[PDB]
Symmetry: C3
Subunit: 121 residues, 3 copies
């Protein structure tokens, strides 16, 4: 299954993340300041383009850094279905808000799945 698994995953990582950077592209502020919106459009955009992102930078980096020596398989459907599993839902969880209800979910995964994928090997 390291076959299918790596897959469904990644597509969400250029999609989730990337379906999102461009939709964050300048539906421009009435600009003057280069020489209500700005912050609270940026405060969505930057703050949104930030968290799609990093939630991957380790998460996904590690996401292979491990499978690079491709596991058994009975676990791996889980730890990888669970793996993206959260982080998907999670990405959907956090971009919407900004504060608490995600930092939590972002912790059990990146720290865990990684200590695991370290250890297990």
């Amino acid at each position: 299954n390291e076959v299918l698994m790596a897959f469904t995953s990644y597509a969400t990582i250029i999609l989730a993340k990337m379906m999102f950077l461009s939709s964050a592209t300048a539906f421009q502020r009435l600009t003057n300041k280069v020489f209500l919106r700005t912050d609270e459009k940026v405060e969505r955009v930057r703050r949104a383009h930030l968290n799609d992102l990093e939630n991957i930078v380790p998460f996904l980096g590690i996401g292979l850094l491990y499978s690079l020596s491709g596991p058994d398989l009975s676990t791996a459907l889980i730890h990888f279905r669970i793996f993206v599993g959260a982080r998907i839902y999670h990405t959907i969880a956090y971009l919407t808000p900004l504060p608490q209800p995600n930092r939590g979910l972002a912790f059990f995964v990146g720290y865990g799945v990684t200590l695991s994928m370290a250890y297990r090997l």
Copy 2:
């Protein structure tokens, strides 16, 4: 060719990106503010170190996330020569400016090559 291909590629990604972070290192502002330049040096540096970067974070992350199950080869010289192909030229395209003439080019690649490298498999 997944041989040669991954290669020429990556080198540009620590070079392009990284030949660039250090050349962005502090040819210092006449500093006072830590306790014309600042913004418009940062507005080059941060704004330049930002876009070398992400244009990879997915792009390249995915760039393997796919080849990890190494394709045929008759396509792959293209989709990977075209792959870096743009993004090279592209990186050269965007860092220079800041606004429109690149966001475009950055879209057909990261979104495409990725839906593809998702699909094809």
Copy 3:
């Protein structure tokens, strides 16, 4: 050894980096400004969550981008023990300070190990 090597490495990259993002999580400023601390807590946090990070984004990205065609082995214990080797010590080096004593160490590695891992192949 591309076996063991990739390994010890990565774990430090979700740990180093990630053991660190969450410990950077809001031991909140006495907040008012959303509508001494802020900057100098952020100036630690953002400025700390930034440099764990990128010191990997290429470094580690490339870190595999190469081993993806897994080297000999007599060199590889070095170039990879030396590889994380610095960057570990280095990450420990830079987050603590902010200015000079690291940018240096960050250069010989990311630029080198990468031109190398380009070339050698």
